[PDB]
Design a protein around this ligand. Structure first.
Ligand code: WLW
Ligand SMILES: OC[C@H]1O[C@H](O[C@H]2[C@H](O)[C@@H](O)[C@@H](O)O[C@@H]2CO)[C@H](O)[C@@H](O)[C@@H]1O
Length: 516
């Protein structure tokens, strides 16, 4: 499917893709291998769709947070650089691209949002978010505004949501508690309510997106913006006398931007893996390769120690690293995609008045917890049905929901299996199962049959009950190790294809209510 003898690269439209194409031309000069750089729209959503069919680019560039989901789906080649190459990059950047103990991408650069201000309009930028309404009123008297930034991508609003205590997945004792989501706590609510109040008081407009905020800052209409290092090139061209500084505090606490490490992963379906490794290690991740990209659109604090020693002297890079140290390195867990979609919907709905801050963040919490809660219920049902004994481990966060959904699932699911016993036994024969490969083919049939019909709790219970019927067969045929991957496969198609409907039902609470 992917053509051998060439390299196709995907990178976001806000990065230095013309600089990257200059590195590709240098590679072609030596090897005769043509390198095509593309920047398709929504490349981070297109990549898992096309790479799953054996298609897509040879190399994908994105911040490290999406890569764990790609790796979990088997879409990325494991990268194994030698120690001499590994030592040329900062160890924390390699940590950002490690998933299940394996390196799944090459780190390129460390990105963090900073406060960018027009020194000619605002010689002393604000230290707090609280003083921005009064500053906006003062600036409005002169035909200017205090601040405009992209309100359509939650990445830009997150530093404010996290400032007073909001968090994505709790991190404590050197580990993430995936069961602990903090998008709907008092801290997140205060941050988002402050943003909504800025919009209600006409200090910001809910429709402001990336282009609008960028045009207004680069034309001197707004005194401040919130953006990353890639934006500096267009501000340079505009000749605005700008500064790059620490984000304002909220309730006396620093804004905490989610820090991304721009990384390059190699498609598992690529027949050009050795060419991609040579391109990335020996052409791109060199002082000259990174300089070519950086001159087009700044990368931020690069992962390559030798080049970073020079960039670190730039006060804009010092400000980027200061904001990064006050924030957090993004997790790379597979549910980051679901978290981002949920928080993106929450900020847009709260900003537009479609939902209150409380309704918006409650839905964001349900969406962010959906995979873990669904896995807990489905995994426990399949394993207790197969072995005849329940899991003694504590249910954890939202244990009441899990326990009640499991009790409901025992009552309804058992009835489904009892009434359709002969029909399920017949289907189990056609799907000849005796090993791990036979479970993977069953999964493919499940995904299509479930995805084809109507969305309702009856069909969801059928999908899970048939999975329990199969897990019983796996226990007797001494293939009990296939049960947990089957539970993960059922959970994945359920949370991915029925995401919106699930959240509208208040997740598993709606299931308990429906069958009450
Ligand atoms: C108010 O409703 C409820 C309330 C409480 C609780 C439940 C409900 C409620 N709701 C909605 C459907 C239901 C019963 O669903 C069954 C139950 C046995 C069957 C077919 C269905 C159809 C149903 C659907 O697509 O709607 O199936 C699924 N729904 C969701 N995910 C899924 S995944 C999935 C599946 C999984 C693995 C696989 F390799 C193939 C398919 C199926 C399914 C599915 C489809 C079809 C068949 C089976 Cl065994 C299954 C389990 C066979 N099929 C036909 C028999 N054949 C015999 C011979 N004859 C000559 C012709 C006829 C029997 N129960
Ligand atoms: O808005 C959610 C979005 O945030 C991050 O995307 C950033 C990206 O890291 C930056 O390099 C730059 O391009 O801006 C993006 C936001 O528009 C996450 O990396 C991404 O996965 C997430 O969807």
């Amino acid at each position: 499917k992917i053509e051998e003898g060439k390299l196709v690269i995907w990178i976001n439209g806000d990065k230095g893709y013309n600089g990257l194409a200059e590195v590709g031309k240098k590679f072609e000069k030596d090897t005769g291998i043509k390198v095509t750089v593309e920047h398709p729209d929504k490349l981070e959503e297109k990549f898992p769709q096309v790479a799953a069919t054996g298609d897509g680019p040879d190399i994908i560039f994105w911040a490290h947070d999406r890569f764990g989901g790609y790796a979990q789906s088997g879409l990325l080649a494991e990268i194994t650089p030698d120690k001499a190459f590994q030592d040329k990059l900062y160890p924390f950047t390699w940590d950002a691209v490690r998933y299940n103990g394996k390196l799944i991408a090459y780190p390129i650069a460390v990105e963090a949002l900073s406060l960018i201000y027009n020194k000619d309009l605002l010689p002393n930028p604000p230290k707090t978010w609280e003083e921005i309404p009064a500053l906006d009123k003062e600036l409005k008297a002169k035909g200017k505004s205090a601040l405009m930034f992209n309100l359509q991508e939650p990445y830009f609003t997150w530093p404010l949501i996290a400032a007073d205590g909001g968090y994505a997945f709790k991190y404590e004792n050197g580990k993430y508690d995936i069961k602990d989501v903090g998008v709907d706590n008092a801290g997140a609510k205060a941050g988002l309510t402050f943003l909504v109040d800025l919009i209600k008081n006409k200090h910001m407009n809910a429709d402001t997106d990336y282009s609008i905020a960028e045009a207004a800052f680069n034309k001197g209409e707004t005194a401040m913006t919130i953006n990353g290092p890639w934006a500096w090139s267009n501000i340079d061209t505009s000749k605005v006398n700008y500064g790059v500084t620490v984000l304002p505090t909220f309730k006396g606490q620093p804004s905490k931007p989610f820090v991304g490490v721009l990384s390059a992963g190699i498609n598992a379906a690529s027949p050009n893996k050795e060419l991609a490794k040579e391109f990335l290690e020996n052409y791109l991740l060199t002082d000259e390769g990174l300089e070519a990209v950086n001159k087009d659109k700044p990368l931020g604090a690069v992962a390559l120690k030798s080049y970073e020693e020079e960039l670190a002297k730039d006060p804009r890079i010092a400000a980027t690293m200061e904001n990064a140290q006050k924030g957090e390195i993004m997790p790379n867990i597979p549910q980051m995609s679901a978290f981002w979609y949920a928080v993106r919907t929450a900020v847009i709905n709260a900003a537009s008045g479609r939902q209150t801050v409380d309704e918006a963040l409650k839905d964001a919490q349900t969406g962010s917890e959906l995979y873990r809660q669904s896995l807990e219920i489905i995994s426990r049902y399949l394993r207790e049905q197969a072995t005849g004994a329940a899991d003694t481990a504590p249910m954890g966060a939202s244990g009441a929901t899990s326990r009640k959904a499991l009790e409901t699932l025992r009552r309804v699911g058992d009835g489904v299996q009892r009434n359709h016993e002969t029909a399920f036994q017949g289907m189990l024969r056609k799907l000849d199962i005796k090993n791990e490969d036979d479970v993977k083919s069953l999964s493919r049939v499940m995904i299509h049959v479930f995805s084809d019909g109507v969305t309702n709790w009856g069909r969801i219970v059928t999908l899970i009950s048939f999975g329990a019927f199969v897990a019983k067969h796996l226990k007797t045929i001494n293939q009990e190790s296939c049960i947990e991957p089957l539970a993960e496969s059922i959970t994945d198609v359920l949370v991915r294809t029925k995401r919106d409907w699930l959240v509208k039902q208040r997740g598993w609470d709606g299931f308990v209510e429906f069958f009450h």
